[PDB]
Design an enzyme around this catalytic site. Structure first.
Site, mmCIF file in Angstrom:
data_model
loop_
_atom_site.group_PDB
_atom_site.id
_atom_site.type_symbol
_atom_site.label_atom_id
_atom_site.label_comp_id
_atom_site.label_asym_id
_atom_site.label_seq_id
_atom_site.Cartn_x
_atom_site.Cartn_y
_atom_site.Cartn_z
ATOM 1 C CD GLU A 1 -2.812 14.909 7.225
ATOM 2 O OE1 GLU A 1 -3.054 14.991 5.983
ATOM 3 O OE2 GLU A 1 -2.956 13.849 7.886
ATOM 4 N NE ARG B 1 -6.839 11.183 0.187
ATOM 5 C CZ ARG B 1 -6.588 10.970 1.478
ATOM 6 N NH1 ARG B 1 -7.005 11.804 2.414
ATOM 7 N NH2 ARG B 1 -5.901 9.903 1.838
ATOM 8 C CG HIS C 1 -5.438 4.686 5.395
ATOM 9 N ND1 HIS C 1 -5.392 4.092 4.145
ATOM 10 C CD2 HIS C 1 -5.617 6.010 5.171
ATOM 11 C CE1 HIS C 1 -5.545 5.017 3.212
ATOM 12 N NE2 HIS C 1 -5.677 6.189 3.807
ATOM 13 N NE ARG D 1 -6.027 15.801 5.503
ATOM 14 C CZ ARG D 1 -6.461 14.559 5.390
ATOM 15 N NH1 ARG D 1 -7.762 14.296 5.403
ATOM 16 N NH2 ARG D 1 -5.579 13.573 5.280
ATOM 17 C CE1 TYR E 1 -2.943 3.197 0.838
ATOM 18 C CE2 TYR E 1 -4.475 1.410 1.229
ATOM 19 C CZ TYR E 1 -4.231 2.752 0.981
ATOM 20 O OH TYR E 1 -5.258 3.671 0.884
#
Ligand SMILES: CC(=O)N[C@H]1[C@H]([C@H](O)[C@H](O)CO)O[C@@](O[C@H](CO)[C@@H](O)[C@@H]2O[C@@](O)(C(=O)O)C[C@H](O)[C@H]2NC(C)=O)(C(=O)O)C[C@@H]1O
Lengths: 666, 666, 666
Positions: free
Chosen positions: A337, A403, A106, A352, A81
């Site tokens: 972030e 996303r 994740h 973000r 990933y």
């Protein structure tokens, strides 16, 4: 005919044109922007931009081929990933670096902080390199990194420890290492008489005691070959300890020589910062000057949220000293972030947004490294994406990616669990006008969101400039399901297609190119990862050393002469012990055994043999030792236990025993 | 507006146009040449040429995209130092061959004469093949080759022996081999009665006694399958030795059959030429006719420098007979590495100039294979590059590359030790006008020179024509440092990025293409080098035989059944002896041992065991033999020494001894 | 100037234009068709079609670049003979599947039914996967497949058994398996009180008893993780046995959960259909509805020839029940390998013509699944290719490829055994016009036929539509000879370049694209087949499990700690027995031996040793056992034979024997 003024509805004009021209004709929009009520066949246009309001009141822009001078590359292709370049990219001495994390999800499970690099301005990329090992305490915790950069020829990284169970932050450490370089210098080496140290003048060397240095053509006796830094006098001078002393001062002034550094032969410097209070993630890296840098951070686990930066004023002398500085408190809710960069005494910071139904990404600048700020809100709750950027001339150029498809706009619900084609944008913002009200987000490429799980690897990228190109390194998926919901809930990368997420790079022209093209089409056999050469015998040959850590099934095997001037073949076994055993045969378990032989064939004719019989063998657990001499050296021949087994038997008598004295019967 | 007459300064007009058009607009120059005082944004032009004088008095030309119909390919990607295609390329039966040397430096260290080939007109290239082994006397000397080609279906190569220490020439040998081909024939096999030989009529077969020939559907008894040439009657006829004879004559006239040849199963013919006096390098290859060829050469070690060729009139009957022919003496100073090609009775030769401040590259033609010449000088001291070329129509088309950026021009200093972008040029020269004064060198692609060492792998290439395309195969670097000045002075290719030099190919259209496109985008998993297949159990499977010569570390290993109708798993050990041993355990050295077992587990319950205890083991150098039977076959059970060791001990007594007579105590 | 009306001869107009324009100028034909008596330089045109009669009376069309929106990709690159996608391709849940056969020839030798897949709309393709093993009775018979597709989430294939000797059909079996999916569902799970089965409502699940199902977040006790289908209630409902029961009913109505399926963890269902009478080949697949499908067939071995289909009305409940339906008998002669597809209640069938001198390919449609037909003949004896197709709007879009160059036209003789460039064509036919008299075949790409053998791998493809693109998957060769007539008559894929045939895919735009581009250049190291990562120690590391079946040659080998909490290094040997032996040494055979050692080095100093001496050794078949103890456990120490060998010898005396009783002598 179309107005192309960016306000007048050109839909019908454009539709008429398309119906009236052949499908092969590239319709040239002459660098103009055409407002539409639905996107037309974009593939039929060149040099055309579209303004379109998918969601009324939120105009977005869409580039046909050749509107911008740009190209998408796929830069990794690995079963891990592969995602989160955020926000670690940098260029050093002409090489573009794209760090990331390769995991199975994740989270920090199976995770290695990694990078791929380009040696050719992004055309072609390297075999992935692991920068970190799995943590000593895996699988309780593992490493993680979203802040990495270069300051005065060292790589600096905030290496975090996080739990596998919840991805909870456990430890922050600053790791740094010198970058590999070759220096072509003139003079600078001195050696005083009647002592062994030599001093090297290398401006801003960035080396520490014990770091690797190699020397060529120094012209100073003893300063030669592979050496280490013995002491560091100051930022421009250090010493190596030679093996010899002389009775006259040496001084290589006027002479051309070469050094000499290595990332890989130098140890990391690791500075434990503990569990920095009030931190969720350290993210992004801004070189300030010759002594230090800033890394961004946010805290989002509990109220109230924090978003800001940590400034390390002198990371060389004092890596453990930093100061926290927060953005203005009205911009901290719903934020995370931050990407930070530093240009001509100005520090820029972009956040973000965590939510499509709240105020999102904002932009801030400071002239005192975060003490005071001027701030600005991006319109329409920009969210779910970081906005890495560079400054080129008066413009901040920033990139972002939804996303999953149709999540970008304000009030757009998350839309997961189905395959889609998420949009990637860039925008320019002029620092002098300092107003985002009219920012134009330009869709330049579309990625894939797989849909097999809720999470997405797309976007969350990083940006660098090299010469006249800007590079946006970011994640993207394909349609191959990881089968998390399926036969692969363990998330094994090496089953089936592994994980769909890999890295891409959008390379955009940013200034004039005064050179002929360097582009090529790649037509070579990729031969760096497993270098293969057909030998003079017509057999594929791999000369590189290699490690196979996954289970191996082999066919026929020959161990060739390789050791001690190739007098011998060698297999060495590690661990506490080695075990060479014999599976239960499938067809004839009654034959189970291994034959060890000092000669070339199964016939004892060819050499001495010992045959170990399996428990399943007809002759259960038998051993047959077969040679023309059985010679027992260095110890007595003895039974394991006392007065339990015999020499010979009634049907297997030895002819006699040749002894030096009568048996001791007791 | 711009004049585009190649003389009027169009800089200002061109700048105005650029400012006044959108960046995405391809500005069409209509195949015209525009003089400028600085190169503009070349990337924004199509179908446009620039004349520019970087150095005043030295105009060079610069092609925008689409000015020529051409494309650059990268054709190797290997950690070896991959360079020097000079001057060895050739095409044979539709395959383009790109020989080169893969070494670790400018020298013969670690070097294999190699090639890659293309089966699709240059879109795609093969896994590298090694044509030579390391020399038997490595590492004192090793092979080298800059002259290779095909004459009458055989490959001929001048294989040089050179010292590692100084790259000094030591030996010259002509090596040759038949090329692999399939022939679809009719008639030509006769077998006279009462004898076991058959004669084969194959015009210009080019085979020697002992060469490989395979036959199918011959319709001549005995002439079948894999065979070898028994004698050669003449250039058009040879015999084979069958396993049988018939009592009536055989003659397969009127029948279609197939042969049959192989490069790989035919041994090289090696003709030792000794140390050809007055030679530094043999370079380039010109097929003359059906019986021979010429190879270029130069001598540059001592005065007087020589430049010329060696003609081999009849290489088939008399490989060791050659005649030396030199170019006119005035052209021999500062010259090396001549490229030679032969067309319609004319032999053409172009030299490399050795310095930018001395008369450089010159062109020569001869109607008598080098006895007399007509000659001409290229303007402005063309240097450091070979000028491989082909003749297409009335034009010589030649290619060259500067080795580092801005070295091309007369009086330009070498500029090494910093990364740059060297230019690659081609030029057309009409053989009827025979005048180079106004040659136009057109910059068609830019390469990278890495700058980590003084030497450069860029350029020094080779040229071939196939159908209506010309191909220039040459070296180019990337930005990955070899770390010679760094942690890799030993120049080991398999550390880090290895060596940045690799091969590229410029493919240029040279005549009309009367077919639809053959071009494709490559989207496959490259699966030739290490062919991988997901088996039905979901595990990656490599069916190809393979050699791993570098140090291997393996994990869990199973040796599967593979030998003698798969009844057994097999491991063979080579060398004088094999060694299977046990490393010192890291954590528990007191446990050091190997357990050999005839069963499936560590439990001796599963089979007979022999356990060898290491010196570091608590039970230092113990052996435990554990079976339900211990049977010693074929020889006495003896102590290695005499009257030194016993049977049993006070705490380890044998119950008794079963003997056929009283012990012999002596 | 040119008329571009598709009837007026434009040859001279076009010639003058080309002469009067610079070679770099792309001449725009404005989507028009130009009649010519010779093909001009196609490469110089964009958006241009040519009509040209290579064979007088037989016009074919020729596309310049950009006339169609289309691109060719190469999608396999494997040493196997890769061909015959016919006619198995399908798309399923956004993945494009390209099945084929990888063999070593036109036949079933070494054959594996295989596929590669695309996860990104055809830009990029996966590592080949074997769908079948070699048949248990290999090498007498092996598998073969030309009909495969998807019906109600199962893969269905007609797996044939054919002889290696003559490719004769021996057995037909229907194989099916469920396809891997992730389902994200709401409600549908009920579990009745006091029993253990949960019934799962998943409409059209397509699962059978024993098939794999995985559950997450079910909220029903016991329904969790990896499970299998217990019973199937009906097409919409099935049960899993849970571990437990409850006294009250459970129903997750309104709860979101996930399943759960796997092709790889579910067994094939194999339905033996025997040797179906009067069948040569089963070919093509047409999904009819939720219950079943049709597969095409032909019989061409004996008169009369048959062409038609087998309809399987309910493949789920009755896989063995099928009905034969043939096309009208006038269209059966000289026909084979029908492609079939089903759209809006109409079944379409197109045949392969077997010869250029007899009526060729024909089109047929039926509204009763082949009971009655309406038919039409393609003009000019279309032959040697299948014509796979899809319906887009009113149009049948079909693709075909001649097998070698210039074989397409009526009356054109086969032209094999010489390298050529065969043409690939596509055509549109409107089903409302139902007349092929004016069909226009457009040459869109040219492939290579190698010529080394009579057979061709080019063409015989398969066609799918995904979204707004159509894909034609077909074979094509390159110039690399297989050396069947040469050194590889055995057709071993792993010698030299193996077999030249591989798969390509032409991706053609078929509808508007309302999105920005998804295209990228591939710049990554392909790292799925043999995933390589440079570890923190700078060594290439492969973490995937792997099988090497081909002979392996290794150098220095280290078996690392791997097993049982990494306490031990482990090699297991399979087969009836394992053999570890020692080759005859090349230089010093008198040294032949293996040293087995419990320590790190060849010196007995480092651990106990057993050395087996080869028959070739000076000490022929000697064994030397060297430890500081020799302990014999579990059994008596005995000689193999009775009263034949001794304990000790006159020069190798044991000092004595420690016994619990006197010797028993006899
Ligand atoms: C492409 C290939 O593999 N060709 C081989 C052919 C091929 O197998 C056959 O022609 C059938 O397609 O066979 C070649 O050897 C044959 C084997 O059949 C001959 O050696 C003949 O074998 C006999 O046993 C037979 O009856 O067929 C006896 C006969 O006299 C043999 N023919 C000759 C000329 O001796 C072949 O030569 O055709 C080898 C070839 O590589």
């Amino acid at each position: 005919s179309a107005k192309g003024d960016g306000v007048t509805d050109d839909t019908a004009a454009l539709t008429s044109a398309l119906n009236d021209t052949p499908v092969g004709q590239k319709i040239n929009g002459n660098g103009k922007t055409y407002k539409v009520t639905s996107l037309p066949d974009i593939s039929r246009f060149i040099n055309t931009r579209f303004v379109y309001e998918r969601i009324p009141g939120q105009p977005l822009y869409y580039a046909s081929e050749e509107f911008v001078q740009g190209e998408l590359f796929k830069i990794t292709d690995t079963p891990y990933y592969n995602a989160w370049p955020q926000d670690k990219a940098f260029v050093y001495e002409n090489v573009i670096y794209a760090p990331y994390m390769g995991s199975d999800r994740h989270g920090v499970s199976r995770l290695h902080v990694s990078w791929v690099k380009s040696g050719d301005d992004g055309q072609t990329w390297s075999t992935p390199e692991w920068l970190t090992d799995l943590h000593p305490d895996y699988p309780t915790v593992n490493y993680h990194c979203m802040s990495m950069g270069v300051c005065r020829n060292r790589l600096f990284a905030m290496i975090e420890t996080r739990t596998l169970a919840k991805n909870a932050l456990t430890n922050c450490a600053l790791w740094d290492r010198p970058m590999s370089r070759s220096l072509h210098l003139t003079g600078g080496i001195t050696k005083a008489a009647n002592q062994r140290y030599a001093t090297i003048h290398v401006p801003d060397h960035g080396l520490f005691v014990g770091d690797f240095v190699n020397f060529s053509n120094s012209a100073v006796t003893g300063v030669s070959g592979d050496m280490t830094v013995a002491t560091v006098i100051d930022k421009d001078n250090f010493t190596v300890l030679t093996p010899n002393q002389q009775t006259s001062d040496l001084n290589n002034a006027g002479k051309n020589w070469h050094m000499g550094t290595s990332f890989h032969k130098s140890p990391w410097r690791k500075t434990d910062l503990g569990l920095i209070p009030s931190v969720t993630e350290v993210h992004s890296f801004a070189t300030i000057d010759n002594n230090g840098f800033a890394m961004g951070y946010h805290q989002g686990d509990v109220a109230p949220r924090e978003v800001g930066l940590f400034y390390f004023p002198d990371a060389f002398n004092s890596p453990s000293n930093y100061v926290r500085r927060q953005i203005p408190s009205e911009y901290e809710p719903d934020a995370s972030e931050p990407c930070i960069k530093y240009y001509d005494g100005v520090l820029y910071l972009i956040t973000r947004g965590t939510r499509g139904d709240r105020l999102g990404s904002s932009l801030h600048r400071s002239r005192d490294i975060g003490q005071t700020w001027e701030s600005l809100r991006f319109p329409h709750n920009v969210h779910h994406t970081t906005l890495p950027f560079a400054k080129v001339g008066d413009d901040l150029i920033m990139f972002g990616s939804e996303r999953a498809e149709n999540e970008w706009e304000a009030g757009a619900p998350d839309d997961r669990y189905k395959a889609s084609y998420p949009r990637t944008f860039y925008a320019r913002l002029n620092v002098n006008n300092w107003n985002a009200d009219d920012i134009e987000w330009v869709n330049i490429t579309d990625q894939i969101y797989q849909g097999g799980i809720v999470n997405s690897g797309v976007g969350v990228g990083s940006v660098v400039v090299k010469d006249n190109y800007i590079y946006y390194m970011f994640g993207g998926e394909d349609h191959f399901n990881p089968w998390t919901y399926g036969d692969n809930s363990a998330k094994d990368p090496f089953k089936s297609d592994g994980h769909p997420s890999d890295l891409y790079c959008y390379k955009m022209k940013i200034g004039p190119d005064n050179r002929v093209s360097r582009d090529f089409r790649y037509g070579a056999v990729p031969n760096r990862a497993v270098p293969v050469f057909f030998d003079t015998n017509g057999v594929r040959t791999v000369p590189a050393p290699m490690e196979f850590t996954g289970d191996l099934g082999l066919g026929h095997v020959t161990i060739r002469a390789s050791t001690s001037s190739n007098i011998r073949s060698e297999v060495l076994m590690e661990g506490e012990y080695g075990f060479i055993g014999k599976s239960i045969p499938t067809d004839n378990p009654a034959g189970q055994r291994i034959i060890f032989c000092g000669g070339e064939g199964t016939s004892s004719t060819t050499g001495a043999q010992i045959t170990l019989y399996g428990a399943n063998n007809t002759d259960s657990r038998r051993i047959v030792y077969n040679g023309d001499e059985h010679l027992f050296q260095s110890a007595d021949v003895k039974p394991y236990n006392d007065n339990v087994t015999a020499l010979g038997g009634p049907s297997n008598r030895f002819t006699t025993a040749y002894l030096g004295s009568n048996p001791i019967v007791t």
